[PDB]
Amino acid sequence: SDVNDDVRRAAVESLGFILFRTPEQCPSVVSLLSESYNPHVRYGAAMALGICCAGTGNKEAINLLEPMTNDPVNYVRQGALIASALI
Amino acid sequence: MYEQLKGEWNRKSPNLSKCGEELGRLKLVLLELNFLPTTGTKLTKQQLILARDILEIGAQWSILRKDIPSFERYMAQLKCYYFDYKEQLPESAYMHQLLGLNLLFLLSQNRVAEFHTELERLPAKDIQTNVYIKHPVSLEQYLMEGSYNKVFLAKGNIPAESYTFFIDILLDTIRDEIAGCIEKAYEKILFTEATRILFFNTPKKMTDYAKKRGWVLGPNNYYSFASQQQKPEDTTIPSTELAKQVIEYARQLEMIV
């Protein structure tokens, strides 16, 4: 509902801070939010997928971040590299 | 056990201690055995020969003593006793009269839906023979044709006794419907129209209707009040429900994607 990109990032980056205990829910919501129309909703979903799952071989978060790093926009390629290194 | 089989029934029944005797006689039969499984074993059919008969004479007593909740009790208890799974139960000569007493009773209480749905149990006793069922079904036919005369001309023709409390209610359920049909936008008619709509040459009935309802005889002319409606509608007044209908459209058009 909000329109500034900064709060739209910070809301969808907060997914990992609230659901890190259950990793079976973070790829459920990121996989749709990481395919929005703007990059910002796609970007903060990429940081949330990285900070939710700490060090577990997931193979789904890897599968979701692969088109995320395959993007024309430079910073959404960046955080996908950040999230891939974090997982 | 074997208590008062045929007492005061073949001649008269003015007394009332036979009621509590038959009541205690009904206490004995239910405390003998239940009628619920009823598989075979003619020994327990013998006690069902008597148990049906004591309700039959109990029903003959209730129709003799002018009792409305009793007659429907004994008949439904008899109807449960004809309702048997393994009913061999040899031929009772009063069942044709008993069903005729039920069928005219149900027609008297204005149950035309219950009238027809009862008429499924008799295969070929309606047309071939058995006036005791043929007389109510000819009577229902005469209500559907439109011949009120043929109803009361046939009132003085009874096969079994007189069916007096049945034709009294049958008089009762006709004349109010006739009175309910006439209390309309009519204003006044002479005695001769109430001699054609109704019947007999100056009975106490016109006095009965004069004390209860109106129809007051004045100078050889009755007076019926108008029972029509006079509601001055405007109908743009229920404009709120119309705007309610317009809004709930666009509610249902939107709001779910």
């Binding site: 509902s1 829910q25 459920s28 919501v29 749709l32 129309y37 | 779910i256 994607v257």
Partner: protein, 32 residues
């Protein structure tokens, strides 16, 4: 196991309902 599953079916039911609201919520707002 009969008690352990029953809260888990609640948690999967509750996690589903916040989602299916939100995707109805987003798709309403995505039309603008």
């Amino acid at each position: 196991d009969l008690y352990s599953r029953y809260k888990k079916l609640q948690q999967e039911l509750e996690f589903l309902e916040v989602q299916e609201e939100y995707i109805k919520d987003e798709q309403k707002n995505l039309k603008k």
